Design a binder for this molecule. Structure first.
Ligand code: HEM
Ligand code: HEM
Ligand SMILES: Cc1c(-c2ccc(Cc3ccc(OC(F)(F)F)cc3)cc2)[nH]c2cc(Cl)ccc2c1=O
Lengths: 378, 49, 105, 60, 52, 446, 292, 108
C-alpha cells in the first residue's frame, strides 16, 4: 500500500523520524539531542570550507588564517562561525549530560556509555582544532597536553616523542594534528549513529521517570516543529556572538604568532576545559593530578552503578535536587578558580572544591537516595 | 518405501586410513585431526608474522 | 503516640508533602521504577487495580504536559495512600531469593 | 600415539588456549629463523657488493 | 554487593576454570612480549638472544 | 527399619547351569504365582549378508504358524487353552520368544517353546501369505517418522557394514526369499551354544533344568565345519543424511556419536551424563521449574515438541546422542542449546547435578526391574552380553563411584571435538550445514 | 485433550458414555472445548472443599511400616474431615450418537446396561466377555478360539477387528462389543457379531469353552496384579469400593463358583435390552439401532 | 537464547555476513566485489598516513612528497602502495562491471 512504509530505504526514516512513538510531555531539555547534530553538521560544513584555504606548514599556517579573514570572500564569517560553533557545541554537550544525570536517563547503560565515548572524542577533536592556527596558546596547549603522557611510568617519554614526531613540538606535530582534526568528526558521526541505534530499542525517558506507553504521540509533526523552533533559537545565539562579540569567548594571546622561547604569564585553557584544569592543578603531584584529571571525566561511567533510589527521576526527590544544584554550583566554582592565578586563597578554595566534587558524586548522593527510600517506607 | 534407502559408495573420496569397512576408525582419528590442525596452525603462524 | 514516634511520623508527612507527586493525583506505588520484579508484580494485579493505575498515570502525564496540577481538593491525602502493590512485589522478591538460594547449593 | 600427528593432537591441539600458545611461540621462533635464512640468501647472492662487505677497507 | 555468588557451586566452577584463565593470561603475556620486542625479557631466551 | 543397601542385598540370586549340548539355563525363584519363560537367541540382522537380508524377520513371522507335530492353527489354540500370552521380538543382534503363564503351566509351556525353535514347518502357502503381509507392513512403515529417522541414522552411521542393514530388509529381498534360504538360516544360526533359556517367577531351578534336559537335548551344538559366524569391528562415519519433505508439519532430527560398547566401564558414567540432560515432552507438568536447563528453556521458549537422549549398545560399538521433534523454524535454537549443554558437561560439571543424575539412574534401574517379564529379559540379555547377570549391589557400587571428575573426563573423551552422525526428516531447510554442526562440537573459550 | 483425541477409541468411548447415560457417568474425562479458559479458582476451591474429605479417602503404602502411615494420617488427613456432598444416581436412557469425519476406517460400539461392580452378575459378565473375545493372546494370531472373530470372518473377507467391551461402576455397568471395519463392510460386521451373541443367548454354549474362558479370566486377573502399580491400584479400588481387602484366592474361588447358566442369563439380559450405539467414520453404510 | 541473533548490533552483522543464504555455485568472478571492499579500506589507511606528511602549498608540495619518499621511515612503501592501489582498484572495478554485464546482474 504505502511506499513510505515499504521501500527499503524509507523504512529507516519512517521508523526514526516520522512514526516513532514519543512521550507527549518531554520538555525543552530534550531539544539538545537534535541541536548537537545541527552543531556537528555546521562544524563539518564550515570546516570543510576552511580547509580549501588552509595550509598546515609551520611557516605559513598562521598567515593562511589571516588570508582567510582578509582576502577570502566572506571568509571571516566562516572562520568565526566555526570558532563560536565549537563553544555552542560544548554548551549543548554539557546540557545534554546534565539532563541525563538529573532525570535518571543513565539507566540506559549502552546509550550512556556510548555517550561517554562521544564526549571524549569531541574533546579530542576540539583540542586538536585549537592547535591549527599556531598562535601562542596553540603551541603551549600542544606542549602541556602532550606532556601529560610523561606521567605514565617507564614508557611516558617514548609515547611523547612518538606523538610529537621529534624531540619537540614542530611541523610534524601540526601536520598530523591537521589530519586527525580532519578525519575524527566522521568517526564521531558514526558513533552518534550507534548512539541513536541503541536508543531506539527502548525509546525516550520523560521528566516524571514513569513509563509513558499509555500516552505516546508520533514524532511528526509535534517534535519536528518543536525542534525547528529550538534550532532557530540556536542560530540566534550563534549569530549574536558572530555579529556582535566575535572575540568574547576567545583569548587575545592567540593573535600573536607562536614563539618557542617565551610562555605568556597568564596562560589559561579554553573556558570549556577550565574546570578540569582546576582539578589537575589542585593536586601538587604529577601522577596524582593526571589520575584525578582522567577520573574527573571517567566517573560518569561509574554514575549508573551508584543509583540507590527506588524512583528514577529527581522530580520527587528534594534532597537529591539540592545535592544536584550544589554540584552545579561547585562546577561553576571550579571554572572560576581555573580562570584565576595560583595564589592565596585560590589554592585552598580549589582544593576544597575538588574534594567536594568527588565527595558529592561518590558518597552523599547515594546516601540521600537511601534516606529517601527509608522515609517513604520502602 | 524408505527401507530401500542405501548410502552410495563414497570409497573414491575416503582417505587411505579409513578405506576398510572391517576396521575401527577410533584409532586413526587423532592422526587425521592432528594433520588438519597442523595445517591450520602453520597458516596462522605465517599470517601472524 | 510517644515521643519519637510522633516526630518520625511528622517528618515522614513533611517529606511526603515535599515530594509533591500527590499534586498530580499519583500514589507512591505509581512512581516506582519498573524493574523485572516490578513488571512481574504489576502483571499479577487484578483488572480493576490495573485499570486505576493506568488512568492515574495517564492523567498525571497529561498534567505534566500542560505544566499544571490538580486543585487542592483532589490531592492524594497522606493517610489514604494505599500500598496496593506491596504484597505482590514482596512475594515476587521472596520467590526470586528462593531461586537464588537454590543456585548456590 | 606412536605417530607424530597423534601426539601433537593429544598434547597441543585439543584445547584452544594451548593452540594459541603454540601459535605465538611458533611465530616467535619462526621470525628469527626466517630472518636469518633470508638475510643469508640475500648476502650470498650479492657477495662483494654490499656496504658491509667493503666496509673493512676504509674504516681503520 | 554481589553476594549471590558465594557458595559451593561457584568455587567449584572457579576451580574448574582456573587453568584455562591461566593459559589465556600466558598467551597474552607471550603475545605482548613478542609484539613489543621487549629486550628485557627476550635477552634471557637462548636462541632469540642472538638476534640483537 | 530396613535400608537401601540392606534391601539391595536381600534380592535372591540368579542360578545358572549348562547342559551338554551347550544350552544355558538360568532362573530366579520368587514367591509370585505367575511366571515368564523364554528363549533368547544371538542371531539378528547383523549376521546377514545382502543376499538373505530380512531372513530372520521372515522366520520370526512364521514361528507361530504350526509345526510338524502341531499342524495348522492348533498350536495357537493350545496357548489359549491355558490363558497364556505368547510373544516374540527381533532386533539387530538378538531374537526372543517367550510365554507369560501361571506356575502350574510351566511343564506345558516349556514343551511349546522347544517345539517352536526346532520344527518350523514353513508351509509354502503360509510363506506366500506372510510375504504379502510383510510387503504391506513395509509399505505402511513409512508413516512412523521416528523409526524412519533411526533407520537413517543407522544407515549413515555404519555405512558399508552389516549394521546399516535394517531388520525387515529391503522390499526386493523379501520378494525373492525362498524356503531354501529360510531353512539355511535356521540350520546355520539356531544352535545350542547361542541360545539361553531364561525363566522368572514362581518356580524351582531344578524342575526347569530337568524339563530342559527332556525337551532341548536334541539341539546340535557342534558348530558344523567352520560355519561359525563371528562379528567384526564396524567402521563409524561422521556424515549427514537429509530427507526433505516440506509437506509434513513437524521435523524429526537425530544426532549421535560413536559409543563405547556393551561391556565397557565407561557406560555407567554416560548413563549419568544423559540423566543430567534429561528429556521433555509437551505434556509434562513441571513447566519452567524443571532441573534440566534444556528442558526448562524448551518449555519457556517453545523450542520443540519433544526430545530425548539415547545410548544404544552393540558389540564393541554403539550410538550415543539425542533425538528431537520440533517445528521447522526452531531447529537452529534446539541444536545450539543441545550442543551447548554437551560442551557444558564436557568442560564444567558440578557435584549437585551429578548427584541428581545418580539418583535418577538408581530409581530407573530399581523401577525397570519390577515384575516377571523385565527380570526374564534382564537374564536373557545379560547371559548373552556379559556372560553373567550382574546383581543390583554391583550396579550400586559402580554408580556410587562416579563424581564430577569422572563425568568430565568421560564426556571429554566421547563428545568433545568428535565428528557426529546426523539424520533429518521433514521440513529441514533450517537444519545447519554439516560444517556448522561440526564446529559446534568445541568451544574457542576452552 | 488433543493428544488424547489422536486415538479414535477415546472419542468413541466418550460419545458412548454420553449416549448411554443422562446425568452422572455422562461427563467426559476432558474439558468441553467451549469451557477451556473459563475455569476459575473458586470452582477448584469448592470442588476440593466438597469432595476431598476423610470418609472418601484411602491411603495405601508398599514399602513403609504401618505406624508411620498412621501417624501421618492422624496428624494431617484427619483435619480434612467434614464430609460434604453425596452425588446423583446413574440414570440409564440409551440412544445414538453419530459423528462423520471421513476417516479410512469406521469405528463403532454397541452396548447395553449390564450390572454393578462387586456383584454376583459382574462375574458372569466377565466370563461372558472372555467367552466372546477380548483381544489376542498371541502376536499376529488368528484368534482361533475367539467366537466373535470366527463368526464375523466367515462372511466378511476384508480386514477388520472386533472385541467385547465391558465396564462396571459402583451402581451401573455397560456390556457390549466394539468393532473397527472399512466403510462398506461395517454393517456386515455389526450384523454378524449381533447374530453370534444372539445364538449364544438362545442356549448354544459348550462347557469346554466356558472352562477355557474361566481359565483366561483367572490368568488375566492374576497377571494383572504382579507389578507394584497394578497391585496398588487393585488394593486402592477395593479399599474405596468395599472398605476391605480380598486376597486373590477368594477372587479365584468366586470366579470358579460361576455357573454356566448365569452366562446364558447375561446373554439374555443383553439381547433384550435398550441398546446404545456410537460410531465414527464414513457412516454411509453403518446401520441404526432399529435396523439391527 | 543466542546473543548473536538477538543483540541489537551483532544481529545486523549476523544477518549481513554470517547467516546470509548464498548460492552454492557462484564462481571466482563474484569475489571482486569483496575485493573492492578491501582495496577501498587499504586506500583509506595508507592515504591517511600520507596526509600526516603532505603539505598542499604549491611551493612545498613536490618537495614534501620527496621528503616522504626519502626521509620518512618506510615512507616509500606507503607511498607506492597508495599509488598502485589505484590501479588495483580500477582493475577490480572493471572486472566487477564486466561480471555484472555478462551474467545479467543489471536486472537489479
Ligand atoms: C556528539 C554527541 C552526542 C549526540 C549528537 C547525541 C545525540 C542524542 C540524541 C539525538 C538523542 C535523542 C534526543 C534526545 O534525547 O535529546 C540522545 C539521547 C540521549 N543521549 Fe545523547 N548525544 C551525544 C552525546 C551524549 C553524551 C555525552 C551522553 C551522556 C554522557 C549522552 C546520553 C544520552 C542519553 C542518556 C540519552 C537518552 C535520553 C532519554 O531517553 O531521555 N549522549 N542523544
Ligand atoms: C566536531 C567537529 C569540529 C569541532 C568541534 C572543531 C573545532 C575547531 C576549533 C575550536 C578550531 C579553532 C578555531 C580557532 O581558534 O581559530 C578549529 C579550527 C579549524 N578546523 Fe575545526 N572543528 C571541527 C570539525 C572540523 C572539520 C570536519 C574540519 C575539516 C574537514 C575542520 C577544519 C578546521 C580548520 C582548517 C581549522 C583551522 C582554521 C581556524 O583556526 O579557524 N574542523 N576547529
Ligand atoms: C590540564 C591542562 C589542560 C587540559 C587539556 C585538556 C583537558 C580535557 C581533555 C582531556 C583529554 C583529552 O584527550 C583524550 F580525549 F582523552 F584523548 C582531551 C581533552 C583538560 C585540561 N590544558 C592546558 C592548556 C594550556 Cl594552553 C596550558 C595548560 C593546560 C593544562 O594544564
Amino acid at each position: 500500500t504505502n511506499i513510505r512504509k515499504s521501500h527499503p530505504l524509507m523504512k529507516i526514516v519512517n521508523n526514526a523520524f516520522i512514526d516513532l512513538p514519543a512521550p507527549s510531555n518531554i520538555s525543552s531539555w530534550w531539544n539538545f539531542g537534535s541541536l548537537l547534530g545541527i552543531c556537528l553538521i555546521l562544524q563539518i560544513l564550515t570546516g570543510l570550507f576552511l580547509a580549501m584555504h588552509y595550509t598546515s606548514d609551520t611557516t605559513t599556517a598562521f598567515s593562511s588564517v589571516t588570508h582567510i579573514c582578509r582576502d577570502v570572500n566572506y571568509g571571516w564569517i566562516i572562520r568565526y562561525m566555526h570558532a563560536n560553533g565549537a563553544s555552542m557545541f560544548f554548551i549543548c554537550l554539557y546540557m545534554h549530560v546534565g539532563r541525563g544525570l538529573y532525570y535518571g536517563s543513565y539507566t540506559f547503560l549502552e546509550t550512556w556509555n556510548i555517550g561517554v565515548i562521544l564526549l571524549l572524542t569531541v574533546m579530542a577533536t576540539a583540542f586538536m582544532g585549537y592547535v591549527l592556527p599556531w598562535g601562542q596558546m596553540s603551541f603551549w596547549g600542544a606542549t602541556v597536553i602532550t606532556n601529560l603522557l610523561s606521567a605514565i611510568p617507564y614508557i611516558g617519554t617514548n609515547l611523547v616523542e612518538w606523538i610529537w614526531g621529534g624531540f619537540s613540538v614542530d611541523k610534524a606535530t601540526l601536520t598530523r594534528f591537521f589530519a586527525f582534526h580532519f578525519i575524527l568528526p566522521f568517526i564521531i558521526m558514526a558513533i552518534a549513529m550507534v548512539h541513536l541505534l541503541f536508543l531506539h530499542e527502548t525509546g525516550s525517558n520523560n521528566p516524571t521517570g514513569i513509563s509513558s506507553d499509555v500516552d505516546k504521540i508520533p514524532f511528526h509533526p509535534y517534535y519536528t516543529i518543536k525542534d525547528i523552533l529550538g534550532a532557530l533559537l540556536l542560530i540566534l545565539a550563534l549569530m549574536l556572538l558572530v555579529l556582535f562579540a566575535p572575540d568574547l569567548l576567545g583569548d587575545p594571546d592567540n593573535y600573536t604568532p607562536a614563539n618557542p622561547l617565551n610562555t605568556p604569564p597568564h596562560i589559561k585553557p579554553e573556558w570549556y576545559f577550565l574546570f578540569a584544569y582546576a582539578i589537575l592543578r589542585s593536586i601538587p603531584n604529577k601522577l596524582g593530578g593526571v589520575l584525578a584529571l582522567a577520573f574527573s571525566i571517567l566517573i560518569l561511567a561509574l554514575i549508573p552503578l551508584l543509583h540507590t533510589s527506588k524512583q528514577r527521576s529527581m522530580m520527587f526527590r528534594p534532597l537529591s535536587q539540592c545535592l544536584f544544584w550544589a554540584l552545579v554550583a561547585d562546577l561553576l566554582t571550579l571554572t572560576w578558580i581555573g580562570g584565576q592565578p595560583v595564589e592565596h586563597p585560590y589554592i585552598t578554595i580549589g582544593q576544597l572544591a575538588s574534594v567536594l566534587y568527588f565527595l558529592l558524586i561518590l558518597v552523599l548522593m547515594p546516601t540521600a537516595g537511601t534516606i529517601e527510600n527509608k522515609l517513604l517506607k520502602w | 518405501s524408505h527401507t530401500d534407502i542405501k548410502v552410495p559408495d563414497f570409497s573414491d573420496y575416503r582417505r587411505p586410513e579409513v578405506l576398510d569397512s572391517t576396521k575401527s576408525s577410533k584409532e586413526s582419528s587423532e592422526a587425521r585431526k592432528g594433520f588438519s590442525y597442523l595445517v591450520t596452525a602453520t597458516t596462522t603462524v605465517g599470517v601472524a608474522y | 503516640v510517644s515521643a519519637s514516634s510522633r516526630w518520625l511520623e511528622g517528618i515522614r508527612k513533611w517529606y511526603y508533602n515535599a515530594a509533591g507527586f500527590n499534586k498530580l493525583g499519583l500514589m507512591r506505588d505509581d512512581t516506582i521504577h519498573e524493574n523485572d520484579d516490578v513488571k512481574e508484580a504489576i502483571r499479577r494485579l487484578p483488572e480493576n487495580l490495573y485499570n486505576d493505575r493506568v488512568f492515574r498515570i495517564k492523567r498525571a502525564l497529561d498534567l505534566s504536559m500542560r505544566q499544571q496540577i490538580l486543585p487542592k481538593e483532589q490531592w492524594t491525602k497522606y493517610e489514604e495512600d494505599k500500598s496496593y502493590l506491596e504484597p505482590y512485589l514482596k512475594e515476587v522478591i521472596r520467590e526470586r531469593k528462593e531461586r537464588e538460594e537454590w543456585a548456590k547449593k | 600415539a606412536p605417530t607424530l600427528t597423534a601426539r601433537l593432537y593429544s598434547l597441543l591441539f585439543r584445547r584452544t588456549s594451548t593452540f594459541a600458545l603454540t601459535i605465538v611461540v611458533g611465530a616467535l621462533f619462526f621470525e628469527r629463523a626466517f630472518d636469518q635464512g633470508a638475510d643469508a640468501i640475500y648476502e650470498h647472492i650479492n657477495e662483494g657488493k654490499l656496504w658491509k662487505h667493503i666496509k673493512h677497507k676504509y674504516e681503520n | 554487593m554481589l553476594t549471590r555468588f558465594l557458595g559451593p557451586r561457584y568455587r567449584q566452577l572457579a576451580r574448574n576454570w582456573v587453568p584455562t584463565a591461566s593459559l589465556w593470561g600466558a598467551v597474552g603475556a607471550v603475545g605482548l612480549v613478542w609484539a613489543t620486542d621487549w629486550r628485557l625479557i627476550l635477552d634471557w631466551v637462548p636462541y632469540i638472544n642472538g638476534k640483537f | 527399619t530396613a535400608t537401601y543397601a540392606q534391601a539391595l542385598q536381600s534380592v535372591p540370586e540368579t542360578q545358572v547351569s549348562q547342559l551338554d549340548n551347550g544350552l544355558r539355563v538360568a532362573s530366579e525363584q520368587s514367591s509370585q504365582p505367575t511366571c515368564t519363560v523364554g528363549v533368547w537367541i544371538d542371531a539378528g540382522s547383523r549376521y546377514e549378508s545382502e543376499k538373505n537380508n530380512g531372513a530372520g524377520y521372515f522366520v520370526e513371522h512364521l514361528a507361530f504358524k504350526g509345526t510338524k507335530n502341531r499342524p495348522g492353527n492348533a498350536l495357537e489354540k493350545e496357548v489359549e487353552s491355558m490363558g497364556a500370552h505368547l510373544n516374540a521380538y527381533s532386533t539387530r543382534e538378538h531374537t526372543a520368544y517367550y510365554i507369560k503363564a501361571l506356575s502350574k503351566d510351566l511343564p506345558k509351556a516349556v514343551e511349546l517353546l522347544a517345539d517352536i525353535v526346532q520344527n518350523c514347518s514353513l508351509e509354502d502357502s503360509q510363506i506366500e501369505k506372510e510375504r504379502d503381509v510383510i510387503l504391506q507392513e513395509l509399505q505402511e512403515n513409512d508413516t512412523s517418522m521416528r523409526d524412519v529417522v533411526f533407520n537413517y541414522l543407522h544407515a549413515t552411521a555404519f555405512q558399508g557394514t552389516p549394521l546399516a542393514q535394517s531388520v525387515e530388509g529391503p522390499s526386493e529381498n523379501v520378494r525373492k526369499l525362498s524356503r531354501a534360504d529360510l531353512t539355511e538360516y535356521l540350520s546355520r544360526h539356531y544352535k545350542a551354544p547361542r541360545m539361553v533359556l531364561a525363566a522368572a517367577g514362581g518356580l524351582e531351578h531344578r524342575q526347569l533344568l530337568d524339563l530342559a534336559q527332556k525337551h532341548f537335548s536334541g539341539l546340535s551344538g557342534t558348530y558344523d565345519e567352520d560355519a561359525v559366524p563371528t562379528l567384526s569391528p564396524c567402521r563409524f562415519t561422521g556424515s549427514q543424511i537429509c530427507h526433505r519433505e516440506d509437506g509434513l508439519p513437524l521435523a524429526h532430527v537425530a544426532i549421535a556419536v560413536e559409543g563405547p560398547g556393551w561391556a565397557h566401564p565407561d557406560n555407567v558414567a554416560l548413563q549419568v551424563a544423559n540423566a543430567i540432560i534429561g528429556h521433555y515432552d509437551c505434556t509434562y507438568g513441571g513447566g519452567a521449574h524443571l532441573s534440566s536447563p534444556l528442558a526448562s528453556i524448551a518449555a519457556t521458549n517453545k523450542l520443540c515438541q519433544s526430545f530425548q537422549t539415547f545410548n544404544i549398545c552393540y558389540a564393541d560399538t554403539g550410538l550415543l546422542g539425542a533425538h528431537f521433534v520440533c517445528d521447522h523454524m526452531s531447529i537452529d535454537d534446539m541444536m545450539f542449546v543441545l550442543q551447548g549443554q554437551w560442551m557444558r558437561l564436557c568442560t564444567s560439571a558440578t557435584e549437585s547435578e551429578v548427584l541428581r543424575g545418580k539418583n535418577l539412574l538408581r530409581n530407573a534401574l530399581v523401577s525397570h526391574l519390577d515384575g516377571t517379564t523385565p527380570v526374564c529379559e534382564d537374564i536373557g540379555r545379560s547371559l548373552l552380553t556379559y556372560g553373567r547377570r550382574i546383581p543390583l549391589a554391583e550396579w550400586e557400587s559402580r554408580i556410587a563411584e562416579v563424581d564430577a571428575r569422572v563425568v568430565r573426563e568421560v564426556c571429554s573423551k566421547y563428545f568433545y571435538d568428535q565428528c557426529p552422525a546426523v539424520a533429518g526428516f521433514g521440513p529441514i531447510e533450517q537444519l545447519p550445514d554439516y560444517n556448522r554442526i561440526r564446529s559446534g562440537m568445541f568451544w574457542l573459550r576452552f | 485433550k488433543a493428544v488424547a483425541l489422536q486415538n479414535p477409541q477415546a472419542h468413541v468411548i466418550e460419545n458412548l458414555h454420553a449416549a448411554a447415560y443422562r446425568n452422572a457417568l455422562a461427563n467426559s474425562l476432558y474439558c468441553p472445548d467451549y469451557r477451556i479458559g473459563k475455569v476459575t479458582p473458586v470452582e477448584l476451591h469448592d470442588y476440593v472443599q466438597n469432595h476431598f474429605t476423610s470418609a472418601r479417602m484411602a491411603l495405601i503404602g508398599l514399602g513403609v511400616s504401618h505406624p508411620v502411615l498412621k501417624q501421618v494420617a492422624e496428624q494431617f488427613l484427619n483435619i480434612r474431615g467434614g464430609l460434604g456432598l453425596s452425588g446423583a444416581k446413574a440414570k440409564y436412557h440409551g440412544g445414538e450418537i453419530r459423528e462423520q469425519n471421513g476417516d479410512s476406517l469406521v469405528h463403532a460400539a454397541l452396548v447395553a446396561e449390564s450390572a454393578a461392580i462387586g456383584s454376583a452378575e459382574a462375574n458372569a459378565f466377565s466370563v461372558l466377555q472372555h467367552v466372546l473375545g477380548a483381544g489376542p493372546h498371541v502376536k499376529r494370531g488368528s484368534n482361533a478360539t475367539s467366537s466373535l472373530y470366527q463368526a464375523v470372518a466367515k462372511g466378511v473377507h476384508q480386514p477388520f477387528d472386533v472385541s467385547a467391551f465391558n465396564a462396571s461402576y459402583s451402581d451401573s455397568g455397560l456390556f457390549g462389543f466394539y468393532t473397527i471395519s472399512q466403510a462398506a463392510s461395517a454393517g456386515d460386521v455389526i450384523k454378524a457379531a449381533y447374530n453370534q451373541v444372539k445364538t449364544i443367548a438362545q442356549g448354544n454354549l459348550s462347557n469346554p469353552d466356558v472352562q477355557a474362558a474361566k481359565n483366561k479370566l483367572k490368568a488375566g486377573y492374576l497377571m494383572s496384579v504382579e507389578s507394584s502399580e497394578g497391585f496398588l491400584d487393585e488394593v486402592g479400588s477395593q479399599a474405596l469400593a468395599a472398605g476391605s481387602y480380598t486376597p486373590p484366592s477368594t477372587v479365584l474361588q468366586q470366579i470358579d463358583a460361576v455357573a454356566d447358566a448365569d452366562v446364558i442369563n447375561a446373554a439374555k439380559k443383553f439381547v433384550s435390552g435398550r441398546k446404545s450405539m456410537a460410531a465414527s467414520g464414513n457412516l454411509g453404510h453403518t446401520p441404526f439401532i432399529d435396523e439391527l
